[PDB]
Symmetry: C2
């Protein structure tokens, strides 16, 4: 297909909740070498976000049913799923590295993709062992921090993508870097700063995200 | 080791990996040894899900594509993707129908299993019908009907009217009558008849039996109500 038939099919796949098909088309569209529009950028994220999501919950369940045990079929199936999963993260990371991350000028685009690279290194960190864990945590952090730097420098505290970044970086703090106080701090600040500037917005976008921030706040700053 | 396959199928269930689960179960069954009651369900559940979500995709695309009746026309894209999903669904169904023919359907032994697998054959033809152009469609609808009818005959003779398998069969068969076969009277008659004969025998069922029978009965009466309004 040409670059436009992939992109509407991906949109059809989305409607159909055929999320791996969606990812397949989105990967193909990106490999036609041309910059992604803003909504196309969101199709790519949604595609892989959903594929990996199912793999992560599968892995989470299989790991639960393993740490107790305390036969081999469990470890094996966990390993099959880990491998599929990493397979998928490596594929997004390769796609980010080779076509997306900086054939860019926009503060938004550079931040979107870096947020994504933070995200998919983070998924890999959850599954990692212990140097190539330390190593991918480091990478995720670097990806997120650099997106954080740019977005502070160049975007408003209500920008939906900047909020998504803070949201996720604060989840990384809490869940990956065992840094609860950094996570609660980052979530609080981000909420408060976005709240302060809400009146200026055409914004259910920012608002939706603000809620997930608070939700996390509630869960974390709590017994 | 089928022991391993069955094990990973149960693992795949918990983790909601239904392709996998259905693959483990396709394996197990291909070892040639019969399938216990629980393993019957793992097979059923595994494929129920792969198909069901494939059905859902197809319905979404069939709807988009079926209008497209002229804000249009991103036409080529839509039709081809529906057809891709189609062949894919059709392959799963055939795989299930294959398993049934090439291993699972038998003369033997147990009556609950024979009815179960012939009920499954009918369900999976039925899924194929929902998607079919025909005749070839009047053709697959027949095959659904024949399978269901072979299960019906067996359960009527070899099972009591309250049986959860016999009831689920009657239930599905009656839905197939109304939804697919354009035989709403057959559907109603069968659903009422099934429900009443269960009801009249419910009294002879021990404490630890009826919650299952009665739950399907509630689904039979529901449909009856809906098919009268």
């Amino acid at each position: 297909m040409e670059r436009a038939s992939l992109i509407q099919k991906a949109k059809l796949a989305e409607q159909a909740e055929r999320y791996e098909d969606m990812a397949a088309f989105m990967k193909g569209a990106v490999e036609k070498g041309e910059e992604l529009s803003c909504e196309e950028r969101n199709l790519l994220s949604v595609a892989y976000k959903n594929v990996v999501g199912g793999q992560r919950a599968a892995w989470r369940v299989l790991s639960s049913i393993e740490q107790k045990s305390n036969g081999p079929e469990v470890r094996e199936y966990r390993e099959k799923v880990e491998t599929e999963l990493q397979g998928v993260c490596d594929t997004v990371l390769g796609l980010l590295d080779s076509h997306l991350i900086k054939e860019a000028g926009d503060a938004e685009s550079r931040v979107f993709y870096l947020k994504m690279k933070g995200d998919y290194y983070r998924y890999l960190a959850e599954v990692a062992t212990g140097d190539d864990k330390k190593r991918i945590i480091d990478s995720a952090r670097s990806a997120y921090q650099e997106a954080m730097d740019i977005s502070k420098k160049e975007m408003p505290p209500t920008n939906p993508i900047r909020l998504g970044l803070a949201l996720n970086f604060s989840v990384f703090h809490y869940e990956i870097a065992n840094s609860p106080e950094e996570a609660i701090s980052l979530a609080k600040t981000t909420f408060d700063e976005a709240m302060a500037d809400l009146h200026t917005l055409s914004y259910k976008d920012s608002t939706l995200i603000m809620q997930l921030l608070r939700d996390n706040l509630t869960l974390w700053t709590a017994d």
